[PDB]
Amino acid sequence: SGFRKMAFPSGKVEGCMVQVTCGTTTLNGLWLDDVVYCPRHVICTSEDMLNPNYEDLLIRKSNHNFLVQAGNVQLRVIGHSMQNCVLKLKVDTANPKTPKYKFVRIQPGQTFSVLACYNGSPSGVYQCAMRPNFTIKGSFLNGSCGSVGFNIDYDCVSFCYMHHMELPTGVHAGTDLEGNFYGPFVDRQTAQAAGTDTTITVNVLAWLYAAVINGDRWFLNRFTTTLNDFNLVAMKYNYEPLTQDHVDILGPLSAQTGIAVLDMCASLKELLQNGMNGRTILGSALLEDEFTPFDVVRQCSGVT
Amino acid sequence: SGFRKMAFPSGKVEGCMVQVTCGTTTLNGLWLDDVVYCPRHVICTSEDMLNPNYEDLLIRKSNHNFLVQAGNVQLRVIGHSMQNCVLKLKVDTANPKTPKYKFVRIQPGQTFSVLACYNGSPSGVYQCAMRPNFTIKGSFLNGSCGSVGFNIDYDCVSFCYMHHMELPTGVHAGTDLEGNFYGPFVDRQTAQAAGTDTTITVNVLAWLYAAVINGDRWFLNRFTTTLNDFNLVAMKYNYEPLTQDHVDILGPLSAQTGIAVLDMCASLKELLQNGMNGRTILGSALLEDEFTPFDVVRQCSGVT
Lengths: 304, 304
Ligand SMILES: *CC(=O)N1CCN(S(=O)(=O)c2cc(C)ccc2C)CC1
Ligand SMILES: *CC(=O)N1CCN(S(=O)(=O)c2cc(C)ccc2C)CC1
Known about the structure:
2 copies of one chain form a homodimer.
Chain A: H1 11-14, E1 17-22, E2 25-32, E3 35-39, H2 54-59, E4 66-70, E5 73-75, E6 77-83, E7 86-91, E8 100-103, E9 111-118, E10 121-129, E11 148-153, E12 156-166, E13 172-175, H3 201-213, H4 227-236, H5 244-249, H6 251-257, H7 261-274, H8 293-301
Parallel strand pairs in A: 8-12
Antiparallel strand pairs in A: 1-2, 1-4, 2-3, 3-7, 4-5, 6-7, 9-10, 9-11, 11-12, 12-13
Helix pairs in contact in A: 3-7, 3-8, 4-7
Bound molecules: the ligand *CC(=O)N1CCN(S(=O)(=O)c2cc(C)ccc2C)CC1 (2 copies).
One copy of the ligand *CC(=O)N1CCN(S(=O)(=O)c2cc(C)ccc2C)CC1 is lined by residues 25, 27, 41, 44-46, 49, 140, 142-145, 163 of chain A.
Protein name (chains A, B): 3C-like proteinase nsp5
Cytoplasmic side (chains A, B): 1-304
Subunit structure (chains A, B): 3CL-PRO exists as monomer and homodimer. Only the homodimer shows catalytic activity. Interacts with host FBXO22; this interaction promotes the proteasomal degradation of nsp5.
């Protein structure tokens, strides 16, 4: 029993972290086979970041300008290219610790683990979600860029995030490993505001299932609702509209608990309308929305 | 910017996890040099657990009864001994992935990372604290026992916890790596109730410093207090009495923020007396007490 915000074991990703330096800028790269992936803003001076022309900045950079270091051993760069907002540095050595891996572009509401690194060295691991506004709520200081977000399916690491940006509101923006930003964000120091941080309804419901499974049940009530009635309440409280797809995804948690998805919706409806009244659910005083239905099943069943 | 419940990178510990089976019971062992550490209740039938005599149960066990498996390779057991509530299984092979390590018995209020494992395979990593009642609030299913808690100082893993027990209230009890339980808990299926779960005052104050550092400042007020006045309020709300040692430990966060420890105490006092009034601090609706002052400095400065 017990339910905790859990990250994937970071070992397979730790073995892929290197340091990349172009001139005076140091950040993290991801070393997979004979390619090191890193944010293209490694080629910028802070000056450049107001309105950088990356193609033009890149022309001034040669292979030998990209200093790549795995622990205390230097990698030889034999090629470099820009793909969207990332650089791919071809090195002469395949990373011997390359795990089985995929690159996946995740949907908003999907969760992943971040290995926060500085100078290619891991500092820690935490769980994130891609927010509906395509920000993530991270812990990233100067030097953390190139830190990656990932899921693990048994032995295969699916890399979904590379850290690039902090918005003036202290939320985080970045790319998939093909260098395409999540949402409308750009690697430029400009006016970029996050849109509404909407709550991931399907994740809250999953987490309410996790609570019932782990003995926290005070918020169960005698009510039910409909998708359309619940969605009137979702709208008011800036929650994602709940769809039949979301209902279908909650099926297995429904089955195991014997609580109909729409009855749990009626519990969430009452919690939205009445608050927690100073009570807690799985050690939280607000409605947690960074566990997926998959995350709840995984943790509640002890998958490895 | 941003502040997250962060675990240590788990790689160094992942390389130490094995599976231990005695008869029908499978749990996790920790493989360091040529010794595998595991809970002694691996020798029990569920029947035994009502009132086990471990010395007498152990007499029936030989080296060859302890099946130790690192991934898909079997380790040869050449000796076994009971130290308090753990077994030490001597194997003929030093773990080649043994990191630099120490065993440390932590004090209540100290934090650590747990690598949750099942059948010697890592499922995930989360941050815990040793609670003042010597429980931890974990995520542990059947098969998770032998999962360990640890801190990392640069390259040295300090193992502080091995998971042994769930109390009927769904909180967790276990041992240091010398097999001594934290608190009054025993590896017997009996009436064991946790005492008062008191809030770690010094950790809450640290986390209030983390909030100010990361821009959450609405709870700062025009008041100060004294240790004795604050402690009257701590008593009422089941918070640990704040000591000059705690004040001294908060010194560096005091220095960096320019907020006197006792002024922050007055903010915490008002939050205890008036609640959050539906507001949040670093994404929380309650007062977080599982970050140490050390944890805040570490995360806020990007140590690796
Ligand atoms: C995330 C991360 O490590 N970084 C992104 C933000 N920069 S920066 O904008 O401070 C910067 C400074 C300098 C001197 C050159 C280039 C950049 C982007 C730090 C790195
Ligand atoms: C934490 C963990 O993995 N375990 C502790 C609790 N036991 S048990 O009490 O269910 C048990 C069952 C059997 C059949 C033998 C011995 C024990 C302790 C499961 C393991």
